[PDB]
Write an enzyme that holds these catalytic residues in place. Structure first.
Site, short mmCIF file in Angstrom:
data_model
loop_
_atom_site.label_atom_id
_atom_site.label_comp_id
_atom_site.label_asym_id
_atom_site.label_seq_id
_atom_site.Cartn_x
_atom_site.Cartn_y
_atom_site.Cartn_z
N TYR A 2 0.77 -1.25 0.00
CA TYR A 2 0.00 0.00 0.00
C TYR A 2 0.81 1.31 0.00
O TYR A 2 0.29 2.35 -0.40
CB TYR A 2 -0.98 0.03 1.18
N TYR A 54 -0.08 3.36 -6.02
CA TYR A 54 0.33 2.00 -5.72
C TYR A 54 -0.51 1.56 -4.52
O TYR A 54 -0.41 2.15 -3.44
CB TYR A 54 1.84 1.91 -5.41
N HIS A 81 -4.96 5.21 4.61
CA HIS A 81 -4.87 6.43 3.81
C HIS A 81 -5.39 6.24 2.38
O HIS A 81 -6.15 7.08 1.89
CB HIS A 81 -3.43 6.94 3.79
N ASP A 82 -4.95 5.17 1.72
CA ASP A 82 -5.37 4.86 0.34
C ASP A 82 -6.89 4.74 0.24
O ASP A 82 -7.51 5.33 -0.66
CB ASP A 82 -4.73 3.57 -0.16
N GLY A 114 3.01 4.08 -1.24
CA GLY A 114 3.54 4.59 -2.50
C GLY A 114 2.46 5.30 -3.29
O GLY A 114 1.27 5.00 -3.16
CA LIG Z 1 -0.60 3.85 -1.96
#
Ligand SMILES: [Ca+2]
Length: 121
Positions: free
Chosen positions: A33, A38, A57-58, A35
């Site tokens: 996760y 990404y 967060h993603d 990046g």
């Molecule tokens: Ca990410």
């Protein structure tokens, strides 16, 4: 958008714990996760505490209309990063502390940018 050329929920995502470009913010890929552009496939468990912060967060950005400048998402990530501990994944080529600091830098800037755009609007 460049992603309009491509091309599903369970596609274009990671199922493997990466540790690539540990110190290069634009290219960093850590866990499943951590990046930019990404993220891990639905249901994929994070590789360590840091990866778990990025997973939250993603999803946070995704559920707030893809707003990568959402202040809540970014402030929560900062809080999470500061509290990262425990074992990392086997075969992690990154230094956890160093990589976390690289991410924190980008997120601090994201927090400020979001706050600036709201203080005006
Ligand atoms: Ca990410």
């Amino acid at each position: 958008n460049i992603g309009d050329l491509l091309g599903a929920k369970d596609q274009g995502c990671s199922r493997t714990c990466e540790s690539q470009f540990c110190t290069i913010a634009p290219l960093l890929r850590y866990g499943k996760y951590c990046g930019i552009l990404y993220s891990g496939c639905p249901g994929e468990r994070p590789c360590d505490a840091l990866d778990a912060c990025c997973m939250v967060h993603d999803h946070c950005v995704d559920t707030h209309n893809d707003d990568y400048l959402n202040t809540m998402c970014n402030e929560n990530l900062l809080s999470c990063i500061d509290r990262v501990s425990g074992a990392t994944f086997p075969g992690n080529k990154c230094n956890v502390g160093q990589t976390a600091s690289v991410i924190r830098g980008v997120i601090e800037t994201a927090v400020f940018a979001g706050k600036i755009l709201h203080k005006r609007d």
